[PDB]
Amino acid sequence: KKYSIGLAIGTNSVGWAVITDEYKVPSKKFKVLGNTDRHSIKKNLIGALLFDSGETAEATRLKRTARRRYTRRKNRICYLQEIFSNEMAKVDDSFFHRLEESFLVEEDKKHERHPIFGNIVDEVAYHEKYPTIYHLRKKLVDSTDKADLRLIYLALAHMIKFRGHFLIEGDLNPDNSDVDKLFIQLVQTYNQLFEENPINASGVDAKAILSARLSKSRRLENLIAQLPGEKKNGLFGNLIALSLGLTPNFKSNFDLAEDAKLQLSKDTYDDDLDNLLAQIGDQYADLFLAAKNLSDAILLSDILRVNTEITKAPLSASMIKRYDEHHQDLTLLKALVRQQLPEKYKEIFFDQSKNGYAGYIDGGASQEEFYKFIKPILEKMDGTEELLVKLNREDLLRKQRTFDNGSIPHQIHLGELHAILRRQEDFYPFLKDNREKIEKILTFRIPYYVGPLARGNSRFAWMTRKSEETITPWNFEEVVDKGASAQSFIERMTNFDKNLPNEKVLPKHSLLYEYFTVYNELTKVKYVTEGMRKPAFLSGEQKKAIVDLLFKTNRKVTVKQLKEDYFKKIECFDSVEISGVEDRFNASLGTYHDLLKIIKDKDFLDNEENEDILEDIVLTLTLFEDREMIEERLKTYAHLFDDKVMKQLKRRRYTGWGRLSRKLINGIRDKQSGKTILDFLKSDGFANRNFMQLIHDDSLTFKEDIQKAQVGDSLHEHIANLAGSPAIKKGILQTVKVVDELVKVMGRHKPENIVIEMARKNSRERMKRIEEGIKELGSQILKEHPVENTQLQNEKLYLYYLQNGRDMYVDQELDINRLSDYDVDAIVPQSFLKDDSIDNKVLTRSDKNRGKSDNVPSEEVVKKMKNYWRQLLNAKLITQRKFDNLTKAERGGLSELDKAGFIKRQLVETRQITKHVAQILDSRMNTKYDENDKLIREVKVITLKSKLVSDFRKDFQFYKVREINNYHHAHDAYLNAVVGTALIKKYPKLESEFVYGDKATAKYFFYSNIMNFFKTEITIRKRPLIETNGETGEIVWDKGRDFATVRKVLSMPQVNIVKKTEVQTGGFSKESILPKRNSDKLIARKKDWDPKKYGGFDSPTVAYSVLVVAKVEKGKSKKLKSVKELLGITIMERSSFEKNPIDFLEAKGYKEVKKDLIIKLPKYSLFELENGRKRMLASAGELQKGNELALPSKYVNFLYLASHYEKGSPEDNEQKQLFVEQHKHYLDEIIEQISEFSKRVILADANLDKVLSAYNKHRDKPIREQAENIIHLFTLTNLGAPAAFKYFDTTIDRKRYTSTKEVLDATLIHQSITGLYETRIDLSQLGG
RNA sequence: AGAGUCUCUCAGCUGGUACAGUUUUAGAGCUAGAAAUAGCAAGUUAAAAUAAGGCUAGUCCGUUAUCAACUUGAAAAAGUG
DNA sequence: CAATACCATGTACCAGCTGTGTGACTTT
DNA sequence: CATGGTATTG
Ligand SMILES: [K+]
Ligand SMILES: [K+]
Ligand SMILES: [K+]
Ligand SMILES: [K+]
Ligand SMILES: [K+]
Ligand SMILES: [K+]
Ligand SMILES: [K+]
Ligand SMILES: [K+]
Ligand SMILES: [K+]
Ligand SMILES: [K+]
Ligand SMILES: [K+]
Ligand SMILES: [K+]
Ligand SMILES: [K+]
Ligand SMILES: [K+]
Ligand SMILES: [Mg+2]
Ligand SMILES: [Mg+2]
């Protein structure tokens, strides 16, 4: 008995089917377990497992990270309170107690209700003197008087609790960042370099202009407007633009041929500046550094909007400025409305529900919403002009705690913290001794390379301690081994050398590693001149001369440099042909040139004895990112370089790791030669073997040593470690579990073949890619055309912005209002490359202007547009892949071989994850070896792409309509098995391409015509009825009988669709903290916080339901009453219930619980009632639809054709259209089937009647549109959670199943993973 | 079937921080009326919690992955049509 | 109990490692 | 998002 398996692997489904010799699906009688009168059932061997998408670990991680955050912020406060403990006890022995219980209601408070002082008089006086915390912070920073210890704590706690970000390194000078003085010094540094062309900056108010609440470009234009004879694109203008955070281009200033675009935010700027400074000299370093300082001052002026010469608390001062202008503007705003229109006053200042001032302070109105609600109310009135200016600057009626306070660095809070400590350490001796300890609390943060401060109970931790004691902010440098921990942070993630599995991989930028990559490429170069008979390799001398002369003097080596600076200069060749490298060498001694600039000792770099030291310095620069730690590690060589060079060495940091170890490159040696790998790359006679040849050569001992160097996951573990979406990995494991069961079903007989086919908030990302691209481009298109992230979901508008509002084939502007008239065109034609991503797509006025349509854009378009494309590439508005394709016509365009490859890739799957599934299945099936110790491939694992079966369906009218039911998953798998087996049966030579295990015109023709053998006529040409294998003579396909077989299988109504039951996990409930309410739905946020007094959560998530048969007390009498009901065990209750189910249930009220009748009921548990009606458990108190509507095939194909689902010849198109119109009565028949089914299992009288009326209303509608909208109707009958749907313009809301009472007496069905094995439990026989 | 390199792209996993939001309390509302309410005044801030919580008590852990039923079995697992 | 309606924590930055598909050079 | 929780209204 022989058979094959077909699989369809998706992210929510695994379709499966068993086929025989004749492409038939078998049917078996299967045992049925349980207490029903049915002992067995007939099942077709075809079905599909359905499951909810697997989730990533990200959300779990972000929540984990926040938890740690909250724990450590509490610890900071506890540290500070510990310091204050004894001395605060002398002043107020319950202060910290009133703070701790501030949340409680006075009924539960054990102390007085006024937290700071403990009486109403002092408390009210406090708030009158210090309405915001920032008033108190400024007073404590400025005043010279002794202050109450409790107010000192509150100001220091507020700074430590909300301490600001750590994005800036070093200390901040609040007086050294004066915008006027940094602008004056930029002017002075410019006038030094350009004495003949100086700028008159007198009368220019640099402070107001650059610190103004305006866009960077507008402030730039404002300042230049004050300077006559200076343009914003001149050198000075560009420097101001750099200061404002824009991205200017200094190429045109210094007459450069290449482009020096500079932005101060990019990580590349440090190199970007040095690179520019290399061309124009170091005299300009003072100019470009002076501009950097100005930027710092302007950034601070966004935060500090107050003169820093009247207070040492400019931040708190600026918060107080917000409060004062809020108060003044509120007084005036009220007066205006009071007089100009008093009818709206009640709506504005008293209605929390409205987005007025009441809703903005007391309700849920945000600043953005408040501004919207009040913008017309201001425009409508008189005297509102200044307020309207503040509203448009987003600076009206501001609160102090706002979304934009993320700008504040921690150095500013620290400055006020250190000032207060300096003021009060004069009166309190414990503040002078703990001044630094308190300062450390605010400033300390765990280094990212240290991680959780665990003690052997964190699977996430790696930190190692220098001593076993409690870590605090003050002892961290001593208890935590920062060096070892920083090393583990990387070495626990990096790859080992695959060849030498115990050797660590070299840093990517290691000098030795780059010597290797350059010699390995250089060794395969070949050249030929006139006198030479044939091309030749480079000798060891030639390669060394080339490395010394070119690679050690030029960052990148082009072929031109090789020809002129080597072959002409040295070999005296006026002409030479080069091979093995094109345009320029891909490898380069980059680190060599970085170190030559820093240390300026070329002879040190070339001395081989320094190889070790240089290797350790680069390793240290790569391994660590902390500049102190880097400095500490490089101390060993402080004697070798100047302090200036050592400082420059500290600042140079590298990232990335190679793929080979040092031991492999330049350690192990060949036994007879005594030479390392690098030695052979430098010199290997006239064979010039490269890395691949060396480690594979049997005449050397490298290969032997590799195998000796080499040194068991579970199925689940192995799948977890695959590179791919966790979603697809869930289906991969489910697939293997499906195959195991199917083999057990066939009496442990292995199949002949297994054919597998695998399926194929971004608006935040799409917006960020256009902002960066446009600001890098320097364009004002976002100014002229504001856009929201949601709109960028539209393809044409997204392409418009990525192309900066220009046609991509013609150098012209595009109209944003005309996009409907424009064309979206594929760079590589979709006839060749089925790619619809933005990466192969282009917005043009008309696709005609691309050129010819059988190739990549014409040469003329490339000549026209290459430069504009280059800008888009650098602005990252197109990728390198998109630019390369866009420009291929200048590289010959698409070749015939390229076209052959494209067609082949349409048919042969090459994705790595697909190969891994095949390898998993192949290694599970084929386990025995033959006389030659080679694997015996009893089972052939075939992998197909989705296009094969999809074209099969459209070619033989086996159409699919996904919306009808879930059967198409199972049918896809059947067709995969059929097509896959028949394909390799017809052409056994294909096995190399389609089975796992180990002229261009011809292949193009061949692969385009590979599937013709199924057809009876082609294009013209005709074929036999019976198709056979040429060699064996065996029949593979009968075009009369075998299509009928397929048609029978797709028509079968019984298909085993199983929805994987799953225990729900994750969050306990909705996260929203709700206000207090008298409802038992509310759940306490802490053990003692009664939700009736404090609010809390609701909407818990049921992990699984439980069938309880027990008795419950009834009435005031408490008489025991027998019941049977469903209890949802929430995720939070789950551990408590499982530890002791009986105690848990008795706590809930149940008595005499029949412990053995407790049934665990996860989500999607399956119940059958009367007339075949099936329900799935959505929750403990809601149900989902549990039936599939097996619509007959004739209707399915009619719906597909009538609806124009997806082309064919005209004689075919008209034949299909004629069939649609000849079978128009099918429309009513389809409705009848739906209604017959809805009345049998759906049971939504209201919705069914509403739909019938809607269908009888739109009978005069076109047939195509009636069919398209019949497709929507299957939502009413679709398996799963009910949902809303629209028939034409009528909307049908979901009818839900809000009670689970009926399943308590129905038949519960437990299914195996295929659903072929069943246990059925009559629940009516329980509770008697 | 792979391997190294160059320019990239997309994805996965981990760590260190920040700002808001929400919730309860505190921030004496006034006047006139028995009240009902009306007319006003006010508003910007803070503490605390931010999965209940756990023992292993760490400045640690708590939302990913995995899961029909039955039989033996503390459990892990294997077995069952 | 129907039918019906409303609701659902969000944002920002920094430091890493891995594999992926891409199209080029070289190779087993 | 989409689907389960919750309340309101009849
Ligand atoms: K993170
Ligand atoms: K009390
Ligand atoms: K000017
Ligand atoms: K608000
Ligand atoms: K409040
Ligand atoms: K106005
Ligand atoms: K707030
Ligand atoms: K190249
Ligand atoms: K580094
Ligand atoms: K020195
Ligand atoms: K789960
Ligand atoms: K579980
Ligand atoms: K199941
Ligand atoms: K990469
Ligand atoms: Mg906690
Ligand atoms: Mg807050």
3-state secondary structure of A985: helix
Task: Report the separation in Å between the CA atom of A638 and the middle of ligand 10, taken as the mean of its atom positions.
Answer: 5
Give yes or no: residues A829 and A781 share one domain: yes
Q: How far apart are CA A336 and CA A379, in angstroms?
A: 12
Residue with the two structure tokens 């030695």: A679
- Residues 904-963/A with CB within 7 Å of nucleic chain B are 910, 912, 915
Task: Report the separation in Å between the CA atom of A239 and the middle of ligand 11, taken as the mean of its atom positions.
Answer: 55
Ligand number nearest to the C-alpha of A362: 4
For residue A1286, give both structure tokens. 């629209």
Task: Report the separation in Å between the CA atom of A361 and the middle of ligand 7, taken as the mean of its atom positions.
Answer: 9
Contact by Cβ (8 Å): A793, A45: no
For residue A254, give both structure tokens. 């210094």
Cβ of residue A1006 near strand C, that is under 7 Å?
A: no
Give yes or no: residues A506 and A617 share one domain: yes
Contact by Cβ (8 Å): A521, A581: yes
Give yes or no: residues A252 and A356 share one domain: no
Instruction: Tell how far CA A659 is from the center of its chain.
Output: 26
Which nucleotides of strand C are protein-proximal, with an atom < 7 A from a CB? Answer: 1-5, 7-28
Cβ of residue A70 near strand B, that is under 7 Å?
A: yes
3-state secondary structure of A1291: strand
Neighbour count for residue A1195 (Cβ, 10 Å): 19
Last residue of a domain, one of A870, A890, A910: A890
Q: After which residues is chain A broken (C to N over 2.5 A)?
A: 711, 760, 998, 1019, 1206
Distance B72 C1' – A46 CA (angstroms)? 33
Give yes or no: residues A607 and A555 share one domain: yes
Q: How far apart are CA A389 and CA A1193, in angstroms?
A: 67
Which nucleotides of strand D are protein-proximal, with an atom < 7 A from a CB? Answer: 2-7
Give yes or no: residues A768 and A694 share one domain: no
Closest by CA to A46, choosing from A80, A5, A105, A88, is A5
Contact by Cβ (8 Å): A1003, A1010: no
Distance B23 C1' – A51 CA (angstroms)? 37
Task: Report the separation in Å between the CA atom of A967 and the middle of ligand 5, taken as the mean of its atom positions.
Answer: 57
Q: Is residue A31 part of a domain?
A: no
Cβ of residue A747 near strand B, that is under 7 Å?
A: no
Determine phi and psi for A754, rounding to 5 degrees.
Answer: -130, 120
Closest by CA to A554, choosing from A587, A510, A603, is A587
Cβ of residue A667 near strand C, that is under 7 Å?
A: no
Q: What angle do CA A362, A368, A370 make, to 5 degrees?
A: 45
For residue A204, give both structure tokens. 């220019």
Q: Which helix (H) or strand (E) holds A1128?
A: strand A1119-1130
Nucleotide nearest to A327 (CA to C1'): B44
DSSP letters of A184-223?
HHHHHHHHHH-SSS----TT--HHHHHTSSS-HHHHHHHH
Q: How far apart are CA A1235 and CA A1244, in angstroms?
A: 10
Q: Which helix (H) or strand (E) holds A49?
A: strand A46-50
Q: How far apart are CA A11 and CA A1306, in angstroms?
A: 32
Ligand number nearest to the C-alpha of A354: 4
Task: Report the separation in Å between the CA atom of A655 and the middle of ligand 9, taken as the mean of its atom positions.
Answer: 5
Q: How far apart are CA A345 and CA A94, in angstroms?
A: 44
For residue A258, give both structure tokens. 């290449």
Residue ranges near strand D (C-beta within 7 Å): A 1077, 1079, 1081, 1098-1102, 1128, 1163, 1178-1182, 1184, 1280-1281, 1283-1284, 1294, 1298
Tell the burial category of A1294 from Cβ atoms under 10 Å away from its Cβ (0-12, 13-18, 19+).
middle
Q: How far apart are CA A459 and CA A705, in angstroms?
A: 36
For residue A928, give both structure tokens. 């025995």
Residue with the two structure tokens 């519960």: A1308
Nucleotide nearest to A1280 (CA to C1'): D3
Cβ of residue A490 near strand B, that is under 7 Å?
A: no
Cβ of residue A57 near strand C, that is under 7 Å?
A: no
Q: How far apart are CA A828 and CA A1017, in angstroms?
A: 31
Give yes or no: residues A219 and A186 share one domain: yes
Give yes or no: residues A529 and A632 share one domain: yes
Q: Is residue A900 part of a domain?
A: no
Cβ of residue A764 near strand C, that is under 7 Å?
A: yes
Cβ of residue A580 near strand C, that is under 7 Å?
A: yes
DSSP letters of A1130-1152?
ETTTHHHHHH-HHHHHHHHTEES
Strand partners, A767: none
Distance B34 C1' – A1037 CA (angstroms)? 100
Q: Residue closest to B23, CA→C1'?
A: A1073
Q: Is residue A1145 part of a domain?
A: no
Q: How far apart are CA A844 and CA A810, in angstroms?
A: 8
Task: Report the separation in Å between the CA atom of A349 and the middle of ligand 5, taken as the mean of its atom positions.
Answer: 15
For residue A370, give both structure tokens. 């408040």
Residue with the two structure tokens 């001062």: A317
SS3 letters for A1177-1240?
ECCCCCEEECCCCCCCHHHHHHHHHHCCCCCCCHHHHHHHHHHHHHCCCHHHHHHHHHHHHHHH
Cβ of residue A1182 near strand C, that is under 7 Å?
A: no
- A133 conformational bin, left if phi > 0, alpha if psi -120 to 50, beta if neither: alpha
Q: How far apart are CA A222 and CA A183, in angstroms?
A: 14
Closest by CA to A1294, choosing from A1283, A1285, A1279, is A1283
Q: For residue A1026, give the amino acid letter.
A: I
Give yes or no: residues A621 and A511 share one domain: yes
Cβ of residue A591 near strand C, that is under 7 Å?
A: no
Neighbour count for residue A199 (Cβ, 10 Å): 18
Last residue of a domain, one of A380, A402, A424: A402
Query: Which string of b and e fits A884-902 if b means at least 16 CB within 10 Å?
Result: ebbbbbeeebbeeebbbbb
- Residues 684-743/A with CB within 7 Å of nucleic chain C are 690, 692-693, 696, 723-724
Nucleotide nearest to A1180 (CA to C1'): D4
Task: Report the separation in Å between the CA atom of A656 and the middle of ligand 8, taken as the mean of its atom positions.
Answer: 22
Closest by CA to A137, choosing from A3, A17, A313, A295, is A313
Distance C4 C1' – A1293 CA (angstroms)? 10
Contact by Cβ (8 Å): A244, A295: yes
Give yes or no: residues A282 and A368 share one domain: no
Contact by Cβ (8 Å): A444, A476: yes
Q: How many residues does chain A have?
A: 1328
Nucleotide nearest to A1102 (CA to C1'): D4
3-state secondary structure of A1110: strand
Ligand number nearest to the C-alpha of A1065: 11
Q: Residue closest to C5, CA→C1'?
A: A1293
Q: Residue closest to B8, CA→C1'?
A: A880
Task: Report the separation in Å between the CA atom of A888 and the middle of ligand 8, taken as the mean of its atom positions.
Answer: 16
Distance B4 C1' – A659 CA (angstroms)? 8
Nucleotide nearest to A509 (CA to C1'): B5
Cβ of residue A1070 near strand C, that is under 7 Å?
A: yes
Distance B67 C1' – A67 CA (angstroms)? 28
Q: Is residue A1169 part of a domain?
A: no
Give me the domain span that covers residue A804.
762-890
**How many structural domains compose chain A?**
5
Which nucleotides of strand B are protein-proximal, with an atom < 7 A from a CB? Answer: 1-9, 11-28, 41-54, 56-70, 81
Q: Is residue A1081 part of a domain?
A: no
Q: What angle do CA A1180, A1182, A1186 make, to 5 degrees?
A: 110
Give yes or no: residues A814 and A879 share one domain: yes
Give yes or no: residues A633 and A509 share one domain: yes
Q: Is residue A298 part of a domain?
A: yes
C-alpha dist (Å) from residue A1268 to A25, A961, A964, A1286: 32, 11, 12, 11
Cβ of residue A100 near strand B, that is under 7 Å?
A: yes
Task: Report the separation in Å between the CA atom of A393 and the middle of ligand 3, taken as the mean of its atom positions.
Answer: 25
Q: How far apart are CA A605 and CA A593, in angstroms?
A: 10
Neighbour count for residue A1231 (Cβ, 10 Å): 16
Q: Is residue A788 part of a domain?
A: yes
Neighbour count for residue A1238 (Cβ, 10 Å): 20
Closest by CA to A442, choosing from A415, A406, A424, A460, is A415
Last residue of a domain, one of A687, A709, A731: A709
Q: Residue closest to B13, CA→C1'?
A: A57
Give yes or no: residues A567 and A678 share one domain: yes
Cβ of residue A912 near strand C, that is under 7 Å?
A: yes
Contact by Cβ (8 Å): A190, A280: no
Q: Residue closest to C16, CA→C1'?
A: A490
Q: Is residue A184 part of a domain?
A: yes
Task: Report the separation in Å between the CA atom of A210 and the middle of ligand 6, taken as the mean of its atom positions.
Answer: 27
Tell the burial category of A653 from Cβ atoms under 10 Å away from its Cβ (0-12, 13-18, 19+).
middle
Resolution given for this structure, in angstroms: 2.6
The two beta strands, A1026-1028 and A1159-1161, are unpaired
3-state secondary structure of A1262: coil
Cβ of residue A1081 near strand C, that is under 7 Å?
A: no
Q: Residue closest to B64, CA→C1'?
A: A57
Neighbour count for residue A856 (Cβ, 10 Å): 28
- A163 conformational bin, left if phi > 0, alpha if psi -120 to 50, beta if neither: alpha
DSSP letters of A233-288?
TSHHHHHHHHHTT---B-TTTTT-SS--B--SSSTTHHHHHHHHHHHH-STTHHHH
Distance B17 C1' – A445 CA (angstroms)? 8
Q: Residue closest to C10, CA→C1'?
A: A403
Q: Which residues, other chains included, contact A331 with Cβ-Cβ below 8 Å and sequence gap of 6+?
A: none
Distance B45 C1' – A454 CA (angstroms)? 38
